[PDB]
Structure formats: structure tokens, C-alpha cells
Amino acid sequence: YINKEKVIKNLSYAIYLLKKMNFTLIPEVGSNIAESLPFPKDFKDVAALTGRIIKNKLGGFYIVGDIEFGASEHIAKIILSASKFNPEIRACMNIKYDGGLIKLLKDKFAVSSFDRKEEPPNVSTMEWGTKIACEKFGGVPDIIYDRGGEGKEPMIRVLGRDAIEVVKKVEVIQKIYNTLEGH
Amino acid sequence: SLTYINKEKVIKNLSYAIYLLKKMNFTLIPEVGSNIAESLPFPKDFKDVAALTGRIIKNKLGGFYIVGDIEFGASEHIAKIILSASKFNPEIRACMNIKYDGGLIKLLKDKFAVSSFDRKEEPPNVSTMEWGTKIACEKFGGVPDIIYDRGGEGKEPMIRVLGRDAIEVVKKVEVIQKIYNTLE
Amino acid sequence: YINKEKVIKNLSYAIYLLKKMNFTLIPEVGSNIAESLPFPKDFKDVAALTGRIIKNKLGGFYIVGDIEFGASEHIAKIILSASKFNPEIRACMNIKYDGGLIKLLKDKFAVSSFDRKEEPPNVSTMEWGTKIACEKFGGVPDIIYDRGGEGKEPMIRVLGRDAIEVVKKVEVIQKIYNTLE
Amino acid sequence: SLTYINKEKVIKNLSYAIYLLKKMNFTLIPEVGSNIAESLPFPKDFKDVAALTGRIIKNKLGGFYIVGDIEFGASEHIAKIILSASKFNPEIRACMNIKYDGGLIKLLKDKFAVSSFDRKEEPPNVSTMEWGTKIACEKFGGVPDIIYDRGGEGKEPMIRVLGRDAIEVVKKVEVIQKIYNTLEGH
Numbered sequence: 001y002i003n004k005e006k007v008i009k010n011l012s013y014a015i016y017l018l019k020k021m022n023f024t025l026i027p028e029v030g031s032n033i034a035e036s037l038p039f040p041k042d043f044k045d046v047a048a049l050t051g052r053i054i055k056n057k058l059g060g061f062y063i064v065g066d067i068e069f070g071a072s073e074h075i076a077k078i079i080l081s082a083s084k085f086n087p088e089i090r091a092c093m094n095i096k097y098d099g100g101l102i103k104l105l106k107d108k109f110a111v112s113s114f115d116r117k118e119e120p121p122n123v124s125t126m127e128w129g130t131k132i133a134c135e136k137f138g139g140v141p142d143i144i145y146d147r148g149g150e151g152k153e154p155m156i157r158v159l160g161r162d163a164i165e166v167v168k169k170v171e172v173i174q175k176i177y178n179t180l181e182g183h
Numbered sequence: 184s185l186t187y188i189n190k191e192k193v194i195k196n197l198s199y200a201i202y203l204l205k206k207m208n209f210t211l212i213p214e215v216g217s218n219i220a221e222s223l224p225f226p227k228d229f230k231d232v233a234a235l236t237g238r239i240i241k242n243k244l245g246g247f248y249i250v251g252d253i254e255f256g257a258s259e260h261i262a263k264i265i266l267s268a269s270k271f272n273p274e275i276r277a278c279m280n281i282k283y284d285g286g287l288i289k290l291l292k293d294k295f296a297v298s299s300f301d302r303k304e305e306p307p308n309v310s311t312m313e314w315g316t317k318i319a320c321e322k323f324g325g326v327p328d329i330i331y332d333r334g335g336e337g338k339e340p341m342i343r344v345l346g347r348d349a350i351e352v353v354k355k356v357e358v359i360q361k362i363y364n365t366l367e
Numbered sequence: 368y369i370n371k372e373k374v375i376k377n378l379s380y381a382i383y384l385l386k387k388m389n390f391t392l393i394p395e396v397g398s399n400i401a402e403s404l405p406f407p408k409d410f411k412d413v414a415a416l417t418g419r420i421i422k423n424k425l426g427g428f429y430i431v432g433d434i435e436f437g438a439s440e441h442i443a444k445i446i447l448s449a450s451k452f453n454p455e456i457r458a459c460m461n462i463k464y465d466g467g468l469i470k471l472l473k474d475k476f477a478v479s480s481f482d483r484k485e486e487p488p489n490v491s492t493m494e495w496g497t498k499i500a501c502e503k504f505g506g507v508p509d510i511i512y513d514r515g516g517e518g519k520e521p522m523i524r525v526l527g528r529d530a531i532e533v534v535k536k537v538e539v540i541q542k543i544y545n546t547l548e
Numbered sequence: 549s550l551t552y553i554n555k556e557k558v559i560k561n562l563s564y565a566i567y568l569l570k571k572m573n574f575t576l577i578p579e580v581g582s583n584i585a586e587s588l589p590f591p592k593d594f595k596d597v598a599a600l601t602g603r604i605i606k607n608k609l610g611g612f613y614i615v616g617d618i619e620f621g622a623s624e625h626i627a628k629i630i631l632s633a634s635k636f637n638p639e640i641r642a643c644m645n646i647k648y649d650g651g652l653i654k655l656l657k658d659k660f661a662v663s664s665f666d667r668k669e670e671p672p673n674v675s676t677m678e679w680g681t682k683i684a685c686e687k688f689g690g691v692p693d694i695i696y697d698r699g700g701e702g703k704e705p706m707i708r709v710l711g712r713d714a715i716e717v718v719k720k721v722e723v724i725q726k727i728y729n730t731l732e733g734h
């Protein structure tokens with residue numbers, strides 16, 4: 001069974017694991033993690049942080065806000081679009097993008113992307129872009145990235161069955177990034 | 184002894200500015216969050232500037248979150264703007280970045296000293312903020328109230344309010360917020 | 368079956384429910400909620416808030432800190448002690464004491480207690496008191512309270528199988544407490 | 549002195565006092581948590597007193613948490629102490645409660661003016677904090693640096709540090725803390 005309680009517990013435990021991590025893959029707009037009920041209809045069936053995850057410029061990061069349903073329309077769009085290709089995919093987290101990192105991830109994760117400059121009119125970038133990457137991959141990959149655009153920083157989006165799986169994948173990505181960030 | 188005394192003033196100033204802000208219906212929050220900083224007199228490097236260790240971000244439930252503590256060396260980004268404007272007027276030691284809006288900008292030009300810079304002109308081997316601020320000030324003839332830019336590749340458009348201290352800046356932001364509310 | 372992940376999720380959801388509750392039974396020393404792994408050996412098999420739940424003078428309350436194992440030796444003493452009587456009891460939360468409230472609760476909940484003045488030497492108040500209240504009851508009751516003592520605020524402790532159940536019990540206790548307004 | 553002590557001044561003093569506290573290895577935290585307050589000159593009631601809406605509490609994994617915001621009227625409790633002491637010396641506008649320790653007191657009575665009151669001697673229909681502060685001050689012949697009490701039924705003992713403003717209070721507390729650290733490390 002997968003009800004609201006299950007989703008709130010999933011995200012809570014995912015955050016818990018995240019607090020143990022030396023997570024530095026945070027974009028300028030901050031990270032958020034979300035998970036939906038199975039077969040989500042709208043963003044109200046998707047839970048996330050009411051705040052965001054931001055860097056602590058003195059070292060570490062801050063996890064701001066509470067987990068609540070409908071807290072992130074943005075990521076909800078990604079999960080709702082992806083669920084069309086695979087209803088098992090219910091979670092997503094956006095993290096910082098790095099050119100070198102992506103190259104290295106393609107040999108360890110299923111990766112797909114979309115170009116913001118190719119967006120047609122009358123659509124939501126996140127809905128359109130997710131659809132693009134998924135159709136290109138022929139399913140739901142581990143990661144959906146984009147090199148950004150006018151007023152939009154590049155981004156890496158990690159997907160998975162639930163928020164716990166997502167964070168586990170992010171940990172793998174973080175370990176690789178540690179070496180690059182160090183350099 | 185001297186530094187201890189000057190730092191205390193900076194901390195108190197930033198602290199009261201946040202206090203005032205918390206009272207406000209601050210909605211001009213950019214997706215990258217806002218921060219507010221203030222420098223000691225005659226700053227040399229970012230460590231002579233204090234600010235939030237976190238940032239001021241939106242709360243989906245409504246309102247906003249003021250995240251972190253006020254500490255020195257907490258904002259290299261903002262510090263770059265202040266130290267650069269300080270080369271045009273040592274009196275300017277505080278700055279805060281808020282949400283950009285075309286319509287609001289026009290209405291601000293009639294009440295504040297506004298200058299700017301464009302991200303595409305940026306010459307190679309330079310810091311965008313140091314360069315942009317310097318260009319914006321060279322262009323204005325001193326340190327204006329507002330320095331904005333339309334953004335660019337991977338960069339959201341921003342409005343930067345400057346002043347003699349954090350409280351000054353916050354007061355200015357409150358005026359701006361009001362001007363902005365007559366639009367929505 | 369019942370591992371650390373389960374415990375963390377249980378406490379997390381319990382707090383989630385508590386946050387949406389008009390909870391006013393907060394002691395002067397603040398409340399904390401804790402849950403242990405089955406058959407806990409020491410306080411490190413018990414998770415709880417590293418901070419506490421305290422009153423917000425403006426109104427409402429603040430839930431401070433993170434959920435972590437080994438976060439509370441104090442409540443851990445209570446849970447470890449009760450588990451000897453009934454290993455199915457893995458959670459506990461301390462809430463504000465009220466003489467009248469206890470009177471009303473005694474008719475709906477299984478209640479027991481201990482007296483700080485009767486504490487024998489060379490023991491831990493929480494370990495000894497919990498054991499005493501349970502032997503007095505013939506098992507583990509829903510509530511174990513004490514009228515406090517010198518330098519010690521009186522307290523009502525709510526026990527249960529897991530953190531969610533405990534909060535569910537506190538929700539009822541709170542409604543009853545409100546009849547006292 | 550050309551200064552005007554208004555609300556802004558008080559908020560700034562409390563804010564800086566907290567900034568200093570966050571840098572301390574403050575372990576003298578009572579079970580009920582600590583709070584720090586400061587009033588405007590000649591306070592009329594607790595509304596003229598500012599303090600944390602929450603409190604300073606122990607972080608079980610190590611360190612402590614400063615909870616809430618600084619706001620006027622936040623603390624009636626510490627306000628009762630300040631307004632009471634101000635009747636003896638209007639210069640006293642701040643107070644912070646910290647964990648009590650008998651040995652620590654003895655080590656302090658040589659560096660600080662100390663006075664106290666007994667919860668068991670409290671008369672009928674009075675506020676413990678107003679009455680106790682009054683007694684302690686009348687017994688000292690003024691406002692001391694410290695007013696403590698050994699606790700009582702349902703009440704943990706406490707050490708209350710007073711001063712002209714929050715910053716002055718925090719400086720005294722730091723001195724006390726260093727002494728306590730030695731006792732702790734013995």
C-alpha cells in the first residue's frame with residue numbers, strides 16, 4: 001500500500017539520510033526532494049519541502065521547511081510527466097549541474113536531457129522537457145538534465161521509485177563529485 | 184580592540200535590519216534567495232563583510248524563511264558588490280539583492296538613483312560582480328541606490344539595493360516593496 | 368521487520384501529526400518523544416529529538432532538533448525499563464502534569480505511578496520509578512506519572528507500542544484536558 | 549551620555565548578546581532552558597521587555613539551540629525580575645537565567661555581588677519572581693550581579709545574572725562559564 005502516510009515517512013527518512021551526507025551538490029536556487037502518491041493527478045498528490053535545501057556558506061547546508069503535500073508545483077510537473085512513461089517512478093530531486101560530472105555519470109547511470117532553447121510555445125518547460133528526455137530514452141532514466149538557458153541555471157534531476165532511492169542515487173553522484181569539486 | 188568595536192556595530196545593524204524585515208510582507212524574493220550584508224569601514228576582502236550564512240527564501244505555505252546566522256565572511260558574492268562600490272564612496276557598506284521586475288524598475292527610476300550593467304559585455308578574466316558594480320558606478324558617477332541587470336545565460340535578473348548600512352537598505356526595500364504592491 | 372529505518376519513519380510521522388495538533392500539554396522542561404528498536408540493550412537503541420518540543424510564547428510551540436539514536440538517555444531509561452515488562456512497548460513521550468487531568472484519565476486509561484520520595488539509594492530515578500509503577504500495575508500501563516519533588520517538575524509519561532500510537536493517545540488526553548479550561 | 553535608549557537600541561543589544569552567546573561553550577543550561585531579556589528604561593510592564601519567544605536549550609548531541617525570535621512582551625517571567633530589580637536601581641534593564649550549582653556559587657561570591665531568596669518563605673498572594681527579587685535586593689541593599697535560589701517543590705534551582713543591558717549580562721555569564729568549565733573538568 002502507498003498512501004499519504006507512506007509518502008511522508010519516505011520523504012522524512014530520505015531527508016534523515018541526507019542529513020548524514022556531505023551534500024554539496026546544491027544549485028543557486030536550492031534543492032528540493034519530492035514524492036507522489038501512485039498515479040498522481042495533480043501537484044496536490046505530490047509532497048515536498050515547503051522551503052528548500054540551501055548551502056550554509058560557513059560549511060554544510062540547511063534543510064528548510066516542512067514536508068507537505070502540494071509544496072512543490074515545480075518538481076511535481078517532472079514527476080507527473082515521468083509517471084506517464086513509468087508509474088513506478090514517484091520521486092525526484094533537483095541537484096547542481098556540472099559538465100564534467102555528467103560525462104562521468106553517463107557511464108554509471110541512465111541519462112537523458114532536453115534543450116530549453118527547443119521549447120515550443122504554450123507548454124510548461126518541466127512538463128515538455130521531461131516528456132522529451134523520456135521519449136528520447138524510451139522510458140524513465142536515472143537522470144534528466146539540461147544545460148540551462150536565459151535566466152535559468154543548468155540542472156541535474158535524479159528520479160527513482162521513491163525519495164529514499166533518489167537520495168541513495170544522489171549519494172553515489174556526490175561521491176564522484178567530491179573528487180571533481182576538490183580539484 | 185578597534186576591530187572588535189567595529190564588528191559589534193555591523194552585527195547590531197544587520198540584526199535590527201532582519202528584525203525589521205521579519206515584520207514586513209516581503210515578497211520581492213528571487214528564486215536564488217535574498218541575502219543582506221554590511222561591511223566594516225574600509226573593507227579589504229569579503230571577510231570584512233558580515234551577512235546571513237543561509238538566505239531569505241520563499242515559504243510555499245506563504246511568507247518566507249530567514250535562514251541562518253549573521254557572520255562575517257558569509258557572503259563573497261555580496262561582499263564583492265560592497266567592496267567595489269566602496270571604491271567610489273567609503274560610506275556605502277551595506278547591500279541586499281531583491282527580485283527583479285521591469286515595471287517596478289521603471290517606477291524606481293523616478294525615485295531612486297539607478298544605474299546598471301549588462302552581463303554580456305563582461306570582459307574576460309574578471310569577477311562579474313566586481314566588474315558589473317564598477318561599471319555601474321563609473322556609469323552613474325558614484326554609488327547609486329540601485330544597481331540592476333537583466334540577467335543572462337544561467338543567471339536570473341536582479342535588483343540590488345545599496346546603502347550606508349543594513350537598516351538604511353531595509354528601509355529602502357520597504358519603500359520599493361510598497362511601490363511594487365501597486366502593480367499586482 | 369522493525370529496524371532503525373522503521374523507527375525513524377515512525378517518529379517522523381508522529382512528529383508530523385503532532386505539529387498539526389493543538390498541543391498545549393507542554394511541561395516547563397519541554398517534551399520529547401522517543402521510540403526504540405525491539406528488545407533495546409541500551410539508550411543507543413533508542414531514537415528521539417536532540418532538542419525538545421517547547422512553548423512558543425507567541426502561541427503554539429517549537430519542535431527543536433533532529434531525530435537521532437542515542438538522543439535521549441532520559442526517556443530511554445523509561446522505555447528500556449518498561450520493555451522488560453512488555454517488549455511490545457517501544458515508545459514514550461513526556462507531557463505536562465495536572466492533578467485534575469490525572470483524575471479524569473484514570474477512568475479511561477491504564478494508569479500507574481511512583482513517588483520520588485520513596486526512591487532507594489544507588490539507583491536511577493527513571494529506571495527505578497518505571498519499574499516500580501509497572502510492578503504496581505502488573506504490567507505496562509498507558510500512563511506513568513509522578514507528582515514531582517524537590518527541584519523536579521511533576522510529569523505525565525504516555526507509553527505505547529510506537530511513536531504514532533503514543534501521539535494518538537496524547538491527542539485524546541489533550542481533548543480531555545481541554546474540558547478543564 | 550547623549551544616548552536615547554529606544555526599542556531599536558534594546559533589540560540591537562539583545563541581538564549582539566546572542567551573537568556572543570552562540571560563540572560560547574555555554575553549558576550552564578537549566579532543564580527549563582534559558583532566556584535573556586532587556587527592557588526599555590523605566591519599564592511599565594512586561595510589554596516594555598524584549599526576549600526570545602522560545603528559549604535556549606541543550607542539543608543532546610552536543611552544544612545548544614537558540615530558539616525563537618527577539619520580541620517585546622515575549623517573557624513575562626524574566627520581565628517580573630527586571631521590573632522588580634529596577635525599583636532598586638533603574639539602571640538595571642537586563643537579566644538571563646542560567647543553571648544553578650552550589651560549588652559554582654561559592655567560587656563566585658568572591659568575584660560577584662550575590663544575593664538570594666527561599667521559595668519556602670514565599671508569602672500568600674504574591675508572584676514568586678517579584679517577591680523573591682524584592683527580598684534578594686532588600687537583603688543586599690540594592691541590585692546584585694546574581695540572584696539565585698535553591699529551588700523547591702517542583703522547581704529546579706536557578707542562578708539569575710543581572711546587568712545594565714543584555715551585553716553586560718552575557719559578559720558576566722562568560723566569566724561564570726569559564727569557572728564552571730574548570731569545575732566540570734575536574
Ligand SMILES: [Cl-]
Nearest residue numbers: 032072074075
Ligand atoms: Cl521546489
Ligand SMILES: [Cl-]
Nearest residue numbers: 074094155157
Ligand atoms: Cl529543476
Ligand SMILES: [Cl-]
Nearest residue numbers: 260280341343
Ligand atoms: Cl546579486
Ligand SMILES: [Cl-]
Nearest residue numbers: 399439441442
Ligand atoms: Cl529528553
Ligand SMILES: [Cl-]
Nearest residue numbers: 441461522524
Ligand atoms: Cl520525564
Ligand SMILES: [Cl-]
Nearest residue numbers: 491492493494
Ligand atoms: Cl534517571
Ligand SMILES: [Cl-]
Nearest residue numbers: 583623625626
Ligand atoms: Cl522566559
Ligand SMILES: [Cl-]
Nearest residue numbers: 645706707708
Ligand atoms: Cl528564573
Ligand SMILES: [Cl-]
Nearest residue numbers: 675676677678
Ligand atoms: Cl513568578
